[PDB]
Every structure is written in C-alpha cells, then in structure tokens.
C-alpha cells in the first residue's frame, strides 16, 4: 500500500516525510505532518492549474505555457497576494494601460 493512497492524495506523502526529516526543519516529524502538507500542496497546485487551464481555454491553446500561469496568478487576488514578489520566467505582464494615457 502507500501513505498517499491511504490519504487519497496524488501528491507523494512518502517523499514529503523524507524531505521534512532531511531538511533539518526539526528534531522530529509526526506522521500527520507530511499528510497535511502534501494535501495543502496538492490543493494549491490544483487551485493554480484550475485558473491556468481556464486562461489557456480563454485562448485557443490546449497546453499550459508560462504566459497562462502569469495571467492566472495576477488575475487572482489571493494568488497575487501569495506570490507578489515572485517573477515567472516568460510570464510577460498583464494587459494594462493607465486611462490618462488614451486619446481624448
């Protein structure tokens, strides 16, 4: 069996426990910690890819590319708040013009 399958996760609980121990984050790591963490990472992964796939589907493209990740992350308030200082390689920027700059 596997700890991921007992949790019902796709994320790798076994690997997460080993990385928590090996990173020297603490003297000890309780069995529930990597389960909770793998669940949280999986959820945030799904929450980004939800939006990134919508951005791709807004467009004609069928595969996610860095542009779609940037548009997703900056359109969503809470992801932009979580990732405010992050730069995404090949993201570009949001389509954005200040109204004062237009004709009339």
């Amino acid at each position: 069996k596997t700890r991921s399958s007992r949790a019902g996760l796709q994320f790798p609980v076994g690997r997460v426990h080993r990385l928590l121990r090996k990173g020297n984050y603490s003297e000890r790591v309780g069995a529930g910690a990597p389960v909770y963490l793998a669940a949280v990472l999986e959820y945030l992964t799904a929450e980004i890819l939800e939006l990134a796939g919508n951005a791709a589907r807004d467009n004609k493209k069928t595969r996610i590319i860095p542009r779609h990740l940037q548009l997703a992350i900056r359109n969503d308030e809470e992801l932009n708040k979580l990732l405010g200082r992050v730069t995404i390689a090949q993201g570009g920027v949001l389509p954005n013009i200040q109204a004062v700059l237009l004709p009339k």
Partner: protein, 77 residues
C-alpha cells in the same frame, strides 16, 4: 559596454511597463540603475559559485542570489 543596452531596447521595456512618452535623460539614468541591479545579483551569484569551488556560474547560483534578495525567479530552479 553598457551602451550596448540600446536606446530602442530601453523603449521596449518602458512600453511593456505601459509608458507612453519618455524624456531622453531616462536612457542614461536607466543604464545606471540596471548596472547597479546587475552588480548586486552578480556579486551574490559569484559568491555562491566561488563558495562551491566552481568556476562555472550555474543557473542555481543566479536563482539563489535573486531568492535571497527576494526577487524570487521561478522556472530555472
């Protein structure tokens, strides 16, 4: 060498930044700013490289330099 960051290349950056009109003193100012920005990232990246006893600067050396300055860059990690 810094004059190799061409006038139109700075205009393109300002355009991506949404800037409509650009007073010509901006180019030399921006060249100054950019050189300071590169000096701090390169000096940190080179410090990671030299710590590791390498001569070749890795992508990870640049990523760690940016990450410690909080300009965290994804996609190369």
């Amino acid at each position: 060498n810094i004059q190799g960051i061409t006038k139109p290349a700075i205009r393109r950056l300002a355009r991506r930044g949404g800037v409509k009109r650009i007073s010509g003193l901006i180019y030399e100012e921006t060249r100054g700013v950019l050189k300071v920005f590169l000096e701090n990232v390169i000096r940190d990246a080179v410090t990671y490289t030299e710590h590791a006893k390498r001569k070749t600067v890795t992508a990870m050396d640049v990523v760690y330099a940016l990450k410690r300055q909080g300009r965290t860059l994804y996609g190369f990690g």
